[PDB]
Amino acid sequence: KPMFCEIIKLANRKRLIFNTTDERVYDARLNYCSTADSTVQADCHIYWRLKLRRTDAVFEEYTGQGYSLDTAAYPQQYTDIIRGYYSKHVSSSLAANTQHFVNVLAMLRHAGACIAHYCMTGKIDFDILSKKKHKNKEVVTLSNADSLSFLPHSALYLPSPLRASDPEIFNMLYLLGCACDASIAMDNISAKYSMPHYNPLQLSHALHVTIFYMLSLMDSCGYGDDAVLALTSGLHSVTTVIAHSDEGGITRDALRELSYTQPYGTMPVPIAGYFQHINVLFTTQPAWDQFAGIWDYVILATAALVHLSDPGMTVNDVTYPTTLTTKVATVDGRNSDLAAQMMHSATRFCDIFVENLSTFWGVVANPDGNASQALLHAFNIVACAVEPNRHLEMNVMAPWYWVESSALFCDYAPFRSPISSAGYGPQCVYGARLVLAATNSLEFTGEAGDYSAYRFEWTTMRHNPLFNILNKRVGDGLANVDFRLRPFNEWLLEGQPSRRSDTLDEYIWGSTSCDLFHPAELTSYTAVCVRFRNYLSGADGDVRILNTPTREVIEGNVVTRCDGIRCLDSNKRIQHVPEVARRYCMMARYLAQART
Amino acid sequence: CEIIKLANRKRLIFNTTDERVYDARLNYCSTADSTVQADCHIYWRLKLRRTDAVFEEYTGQGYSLDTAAYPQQYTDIIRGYYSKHVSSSLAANTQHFVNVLAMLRHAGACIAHYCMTGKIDFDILSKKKHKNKEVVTLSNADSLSFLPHSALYLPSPLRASDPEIFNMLYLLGCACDASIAMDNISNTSGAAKYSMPHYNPLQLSHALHVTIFYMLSLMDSCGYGDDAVLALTSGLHSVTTVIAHSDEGGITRDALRELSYTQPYGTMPVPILFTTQPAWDQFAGIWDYVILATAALVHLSDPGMTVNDVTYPTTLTTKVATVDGRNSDLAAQMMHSATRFCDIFVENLSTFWGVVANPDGNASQALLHAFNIVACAVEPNRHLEMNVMAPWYWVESSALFCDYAPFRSPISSAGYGPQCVYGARLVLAATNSLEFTGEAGDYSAYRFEWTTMRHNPLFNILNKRVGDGLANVDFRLRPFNEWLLEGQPSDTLDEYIWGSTSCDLFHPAELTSYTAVCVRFRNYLSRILNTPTREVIEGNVVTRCDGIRCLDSNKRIQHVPEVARRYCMMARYLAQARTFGALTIG
C-alpha cells in the first residue's frame, strides 16, 4: 500500500498559481519544550515553497531519446489476461510462455507533468493532456488483436475489454498515448476515435486512477522502481520546490533531465485489488482543493525522501552527512573534482534512494538496480556539462539535503536510512511527541565568575536542537552563547562570512526560510568548548539573571510536537536566503587527513 | 449553579462601546458593633471584543492533542459502524482517536457571541463558509480510497438518533476546517453539497447547547476533559471581553485569546440543564455565569510567594526600563509564575467542570504555551508596560460560588480570596495581629503587623460609611517600612488606597509592606467622631451578599485607579532575595 497521510490536503489552498513570479508556501509549526523546565520553549516555522517553473513547461518538445525498458514482460496471470484478448481460434492454440513486453514510463512522466500542472493551476482539459496532438491522431483499426503482429512498429495496444470494463482509463491512456509519439491500436471506433466530454473533476479522477493503474502495471512486471522514478521525474518536471539550501537541488535537476522513449505494449484489464488502499479518502469528481492537496503532499514527500535517505560518511567512527570538499578553485560555475566526489557519493545514494522511493509508494524495490543506474546516468548528464550550474559554484557542498523532512511523514520507520539513526533526518514526527536529546554528550568542565563552560563533541548543529529554542527567543537567546575557549575559530560551513573578512548569533545561517538547521551547517570534527552567560554583572556592581537555560536543561531532553500546517502567500522573510561560506578551510584539511 | 441566572437583563449589546454591568451588593458588618456597617457594590463589565470577533480567521496552527483513545464500548460502536459500511473495515482494528478542541473553541466563541449580541444563523456558526464546503461521501468513494485517521467522520446513526447534534457538529466542522466525511449525501442540489433545514435561533441554541456538553462528555470519556473545557472557556473569553477589576492585569484574557488548535478529527458515536428551547435570558444567564465563574476561578487559583515564611500573592518585579511597552525580565518571571499557575488553574478548572484531569497535565502545557506566545511576541502590549505587577487577579471571586470547598486553592488558605460567599454569611478577621501602641490627644496609635490591605478588610467599611471616609485614619511612616503598589504619587489612608471605582473591594496585594506599620486613628476633632472603638478594630467582620442586579454602563466605574508602578526599594529587596538568596531579607 502507498502512504498518503493527508498533511497538505488539510492546508486548504485558495489561490491559483498562474505565473513564475509568485509561489505557494506551506508552513508548519514545531513546538520545542525542554523536559527539565517548560519555560524553555519555542516555535520553529518550517516553510516549504512551490513554484511553477514555466507557463508552458508541460508543452515541451518530446525528443524520444532516453531510458528505455525493453525487457518488462508480464507474469503468468496477466499473460492469461492477454491471451484472453485474442480470437477464440487463436486463444485456443497459443503458447503459454509468450511474453508481451510493455513500456509506459513516458506516459507516466507526462501524466506526472499534467498532474503537477493541475496542482499548480486549476486548468486541465484534453488540450493539456495530449500536447495539442489529439487533433490529428490516426489510430489504426484491427479486430481481436491477432492482427497486432501485422504492425511493424511496437504498438500501444488498447483493447476493447479495457474500454468495456471502465471507459475513463481507456480514454486517459488514449490521451497519454496521443501525448507521446506512440502508435495506438484499438479494436472498434463507432476514422478518428471520439471520447465523451469530461469536466475536469472526472478527468482528474481518471488521471489519478490511471496513475495507479500504470504503477500496478509496472509493479506486476517487477519494474516498479522505474515507474515511481518516472512519476517523480514527471512531478518535478513542471513544478519547482524551491530549495531550502542554495547548495542543494542537483537531485531536482537530475529528475528534470530524465526522459523516456516511445511507449508500447498491451494494456490488460487490471486484477481486482492490486493495491489494498491508498490510506486517504478520495472520491469521484473531487474538487481542485483535495486533489491538489493530496498530490502536493506526494510532491513534497518525494522531495523530502532525498534528505530522509542518504548515505552518511563515517569520519573517525562518528557518522556525518556527506560533505564534499574540493581543492581546485571554481571556474565559471563548474567544478570537475566536486563532480567526481558527488558521483562517488551518488553511486551509493541512488540505491537507497530508489529503495526508499519504492518503500514510500506501494511498490516493492527491485533488488536488481535499474532505476538507480538510470538516475546515476541522469546525474552524469547534469554534471560534466558546458552550461554554468548555480548548484556547483562552491568548494564545499552537502548534496542530499534539498528540503526538510521533519514534520512531513506520519511514520518514518519503514524507510531505511543510516542518517536517521545517526541523529539527523526526522526532527519531529507528525501526530506524536518525539523526545530526543537536547545537546551532544558533554562534560561540565567549569564555571567562571559570570560564565559556564561545557565541552561538546559537536557532531553538527542538527544534533543540538536546543539552539533552535535559543534561536527564536527575541532577546538573550544566542547573544549570550559565545566561542572563545577554543584556540582556533575554524568551522566547516561557516555561518556568515560577510562579518569577518564572537557569539553564536554572529556566525549562524539566516535560516529565515526554515528555522531548523541544515544537517551540515556549522559542522566540526573536533571537540568544542562552549560557554554560556548566565548572569550579567554591571559596571556599578550589581548583577542580574539573564534568560539563559540552566545546567539541568542541557542534559534534559527536548520534547518536539507538531502544530498545524497551513498555506500562505510569499513574503520577504522566506525569500531571504543565508550567505554561506563554501571554501577550503582548516577543518577541510582535517577532513582530508581524517579516517573517512 | 444559578447565582447570575435568577438576575434578569433585557439589554442587547450590538457594539463594542456598550457593556453589561453585573452588580453585587455586599454588606460588611462588624461582629462586636452592629451599627458600623457598609454596602459595597462590585461591578463586572462584559462587552464585545469586536463585532467580527466570532469571524476571526481560523489558522489551523495550534495545540495538537494525541493519544485521545475511546473506551471499549465506544470502540465497539465505532467498529460496528466501520464493519457496516464498505471501505471502512480496515480502520476497525486500530485504536481510534478524537480531537474536537477547535470545534469546542468555536462553540464557546459562538455561544459567547449569542449571549452577548443575540443573533445566530448559519453564516455566524460556520464563519459564512458552509455554502461552499464539499462533503466527501463514503458511498461515492473510490475502491482505492480508505477512510483515514484524520478525517472527521459523522455517522448516519448519529443523524438517526439525534439530527440536531449531527447537524451542529457538521456546522462546527465547517467552521473549523476539516475533512467532513458522511455516509451518503442526498444529491438534491449539489453532488456533494449538504443542504440543511432552517432553524429558528431557539432550537439552534438548544441544539448547540446540547452538542457542547455532548463533546465535553465525549472528551471526558476519552480522558482529556480538562483540555476540552479549557478550549471551551478559551472561546468564551475569546469573544466576550470581561473588563478586569485591577487595571492592566488581564494577561490571562490575552493568553486565552492566543490559544488555537489543530484541525478537528475523529468519529462521533451515539452517546452512552434545560429541556425546552429556552429564551435568550436564561441561556445568556447560565453562560454568563460560566464566563464569570472562570473569571473568578483565575483569581481563586493563585500560587503564593513565601517571604520570610509568610504567604503573599504572586507579585512580580523587574528593574529594566520598558521598551515598546514590554519587559522581557518581567515576562520571564511571568512565565515561571505561569508554569505554577497553569498546573493549579487546570486542576481548578477540572474541579469546576466536574471532569477529572489527566495525570500528565498536557492541558496546562497548552495553556503555558499560550502564555509563551503572548509573552514572547512583539506587539505594543498595554499589560506589560509596567515594572511591578500582581498578574493572577483578573476578576474578584467574591459571591460567585455556593461553596469554595472543592476548589484546591493555596491562596485561600491564607486570608486572600473571596470575601463573601453567596447565600451564606462569612465571618473573618477585621485586622491583623495587633498591639496597642498608645493613645494621645485626639489620636490613637495601633501597631499593625502589616501584610496587605485584603487581610485588613475593615477599612472599606470606613471608606463606605457616610461623612468622612478614611480621612481620619493615617500612618506613621518609619524609614524601614516602604510601600509597594501605592495609591497616588502625591498622609491620610485615602491617599494610599487606589480608590478603585470598578469594585469597592481591595486588590490582592493592594498595599504590601513586609514589616509592621503604625496606624493612628483620629477619635476626636478639636468634638467626637464616628471612629470605631478598640473592640470593633480587634473584633471580627461578617460578610454577606445581598442580590445581584444587572445594569448598563456607568461612567463612575469606567475610571481605572492609579497604582504608580515603578522600580522601588521593595523591588530591590525582592531582587536581592531572588539572586543572592533568601537570607538577605531576613
Residue numbers in the entry:
A (entry chain A): 15 to 204, 210 to 520, 541 to 635
B (entry chain B): 19 to 290, 300 to 517, 541 to 576, 583 to 642
Task: Quote the passages of the study that discuss this structure, keeping the authors' original sentences.
The capsid is spherical in shape, with an outer diameter of 424 Å. The particle is built from 120 copies of capsid protein organized with icosahedral symmetry. The two capsid proteins forming the icosahedral asymmetric unit of LRV1 differ in their structures, despite being identical in their amino acid sequences. The two subunits have a similar distribution of secondary structure elements and can be divided into the α-domain, which is formed by α-helices 1 to 13 and 16, and the β-domain, which contains β-strands A-L and α-helices 14 and 15. Structural differences between A and B subunits in the LRV1 capsid, which reflect their nonequivalent interactions with the remainder of the capsid, are located primarily at protein-protein interfaces. The largest interface in the LRV1 capsid between subunits A and B has a buried surface area of 2,000 Å2, whereas the remaining interfaces are smaller than 1,200 Å2. The surface of the LRV1 capsid is negatively charged except for the positively charged cleft in each capsid protein.
LRVs belong to the family Totiviridae of viruses with linear double-stranded RNA (dsRNA) genomes.
